[PDB]
Structure 1
Amino acid sequence: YTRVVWCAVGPEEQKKCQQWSQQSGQNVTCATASTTDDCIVLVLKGEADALNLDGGYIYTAGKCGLVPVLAENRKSSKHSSLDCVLRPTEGYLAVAVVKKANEGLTWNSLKDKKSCHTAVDRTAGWNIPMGLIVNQTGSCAFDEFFSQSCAPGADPKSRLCALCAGDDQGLDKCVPNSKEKYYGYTGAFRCLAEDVGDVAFVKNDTVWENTNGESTADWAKNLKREDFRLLCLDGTRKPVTEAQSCHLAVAPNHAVVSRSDRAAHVEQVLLHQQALFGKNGKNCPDKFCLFKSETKNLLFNDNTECLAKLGGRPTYEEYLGTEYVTAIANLKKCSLEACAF
């Protein structure tokens, strides 16, 4: 039992983290970086212990020796009697969404359109969609497929950032952190919702969580589920109720990572931390809820029921799965063995 230093990405995550530190009796304390990549580095240097990551980053960090410790787990149906922490992870659905009013727009007519990506290097926002697109066009010029986009992490003065709005002052345009208006699952969807982009690459849950009154956010309060459509790969368009049969791929859940030599300790702390601030924790909603940040998915996705033990003591390659790891590899060829830092 020593303190665990969590790594927060951006001003908003550091704010939520300090609260968490406050309530934990400093059993958990924070470190901050303007980028996920930066936070990965802090964890290598040993200046930070852990952070929750998207599959795409789990792959970057894995190459540098970091290891998955616990994964996020949401509501399910299968394995009913099984507890949340012991229940296997179901993965999530990567989808392409568009406005229903935008008739005629299909998977086959995306070229030269305007896109909304969660952030460069992420599973549903970048890797899956651009990987399919490169494949399909047999070209690495994915920087010229769309006319304009908002893909946080790309060159600020390039097309891939043309649609990004930066923060409330216009500062930090395209930064890969919640300070970018159109960053992440929620940002990318708002990007489509305000008709800045023609399509948004997010996960199916994002569409449900921000429509039909589920989100009290000004931009989403009058958003209606029937006004959106999913682009399937067979060229069709289906209601967002057919996600199970109209997705680009199923992605591995976001997971908490740490250096291998710190994984056991980080694991210990977090199980006890969610026992206090988890879904039905002792001090939630009473004092602090670890999985609530208000439709902003800070540190953890707001739809996380609990952090689950992995089991099978998976290497980062086995956690992400073999089909996904190859997808990432082939895409990386465009822009084999070596830590990127």
Structure 2
Amino acid sequence: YTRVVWCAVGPEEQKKCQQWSQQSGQNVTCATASTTDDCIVLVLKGEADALNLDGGYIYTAGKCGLVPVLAENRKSSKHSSLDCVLRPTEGYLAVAVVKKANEGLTWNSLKDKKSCHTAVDRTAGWNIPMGLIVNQTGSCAFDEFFSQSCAPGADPKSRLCALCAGDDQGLDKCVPNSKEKYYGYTGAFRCLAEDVGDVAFVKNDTVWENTNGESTADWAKNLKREDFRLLCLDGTRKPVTEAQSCHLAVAPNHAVVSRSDRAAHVEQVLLHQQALFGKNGKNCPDKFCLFKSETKNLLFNDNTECLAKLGGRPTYEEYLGTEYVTAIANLKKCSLEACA
């Protein structure tokens, strides 16, 4: 009754959710689906209560009537006075990243190169870059722009899936979940770093969390920030320390969504769960930490300080902001359960 069914996407999120479930005394339970879109349907049906979603999916979920409940909040320098849960969200920086040794590559010469995206329909991996390109290009043929790409969630037989790798056994190629090797923020950066693609569309934090010894991960043990460059909209290349003057846009933080009729309940439970397993929670380091998953960003992003209340009880459009919402609509003109 006062229990919440979390929806996990893929088997790695399933295992993490199962651990959370066990540590919660069954206050949290788990439903699992192969894609985020499916998890969304599970929530609409009332078979699942909630999940955390990137902005692009919140637009999908919002049209079907789901609402924003609480947002991911990472630690910041400004607004230091307020507590994390009451602290305003800041938004993340969407960037395009390349190897510095790849001289001569700029925003203006991306056509026909190889791209690495977090997944179709996500903010920094798809909506922002492809929105910009369709525009600058006056064409809806975003599938013919790059020569080859890894964009999880596209047709496995298309060039958009040419560079995706699948799992250990080469199965599940291009599925939009963590079984795909190049899925998500981490997977797209790895696609760039192993030199599978020429550019990766992720967010600023990703570059920082996987270089200069921050990851220990085999593929990233030896990655140095100086070996990378951000591509700016004015045709310039800059070091990753200049993300504030060289980004594609500021994205709205990922947020937990649920059915509006379940919102108050989902909110209550999560605030208590984070007091127990959050950053400074009663049992985090010692028993279970909600916001940790070895650089894999399972259920929540690993750099999450807390889940914050929203303020102004915003609809989904208000949460994403008028700038972002029109960007998506315009892109969608190129391309229930599509409820509107």
TM-score, normalization: structure 1? 0.99
CA shift, 1:171, in A, is: 0.2
Contact 1:230 1:238 in 2 (8 A): yes
CA shift, 1:336, in A, is: 13
Contact 1:63 1:337 in 2 (8 A): no
Output one character per residue of 1:121-160: Cα deviation in whole Å (capped at 9) or x when no partner: 0000000000000000000000000000000000000000
CA distance in 2, matches of 1:266, 1:284: 20
CA shift, 1:240, in A, is: 0.3
Q: Which moved more, 1:128-137 or 1:328-337?
A: 328-337
Contact 1:230 1:239 in 2 (8 A): yes
CA shift, 1:82, in A, is: 0.3
CA shift, 1:78, in A, is: 1.3
The alignment covers a number of residue pairs equal to 340
CA distance in 2, matches of 1:203, 1:61: 22
Output one character per residue of 1:271-315: Cα deviation in whole Å (capped at 9) or x when no partner: 000000000000011000000001000000000000000010000
Does 2:221 match 1:245? no
Q: Structure 1 residues 116 and 337, CA, compared in 2 at 3 Å: closer, same or farther?
A: closer
CA distance in 2, matches of 1:136, 1:81: 42
* Counterpart mapping for 1:1-341 below 5 A: 2-335=2-335, 339=339
Contact 2:64 2:337 in 1 (8 A): no
Contact 2:60 2:338 in 1 (8 A): no
Contact 1:4 1:269 in 2 (8 A): yes
Contact 1:5 1:48 in 2 (8 A): yes
CA shift, 1:320, in A, is: 0.2
What secondary structure, in the 3-state scheme, does the structure 2 residue paired with 1:314 have? coil
CA shift, 1:81, in A, is: 1.2
CA shift, 1:27, in A, is: 0.2
CA distance in 1, matches of 2:67, 2:17: 22
CA distance in 2, matches of 1:250, 1:81: 23
CA shift, 1:79, in A, is: 1.1
Contact 1:54 1:122 in 2 (8 A): yes
Output one character per residue of 1:247-285: Cα deviation in whole Å (capped at 9) or x when no partner: 000000000000000000000000000000000000011
Q: Structure 1 residues 268 and 116, CA, compared in 2 at 3 Å: closer, same or farther?
A: same
CA distance in 1, matches of 2:54, 2:133: 21
Q: Structure 1 residues 136 and 259, CA, compared in 2 at 3 Å: closer, same or farther?
A: same
Contact 2:41 2:337 in 1 (8 A): no
CA shift, 1:38, in A, is: 0.1
What secondary structure, in the 3-state scheme, does the structure 1 residue paired with 2:97 have? strand
Q: Structure 1 residues 7 and 336, CA, compared in 2 at 3 Å: closer, same or farther?
A: closer
Contact 1:329 1:336 in 2 (8 A): no
Q: Which moved more, 1:155-164 or 1:76-85?
A: 76-85
Q: Structure 1 residues 14 and 336, CA, compared in 2 at 3 Å: closer, same or farther?
A: closer
Q: Structure 1 residues 336 and 237, CA, compared in 2 at 3 Å: closer, same or farther?
A: farther
Output one character per residue of 1:79-120: Cα deviation in whole Å (capped at 9) or x when no partner: 111000000000000000000000000000000000000000
CA shift, 1:338, in A, is: 5.8
CA distance in 2, matches of 1:169, 1:328: 35
CA shift, 1:77, in A, is: 1.2
What secondary structure, in the 3-state scheme, does the structure 1 residue paired with 2:2 have? coil
Unpaired runs of at least 5, structure 1: none
CA distance in 2, matches of 1:263, 1:317: 17
CA shift, 1:337, in A, is: 12
CA distance in 2, matches of 1:255, 1:191: 26
Contact 2:119 2:151 in 1 (8 A): yes
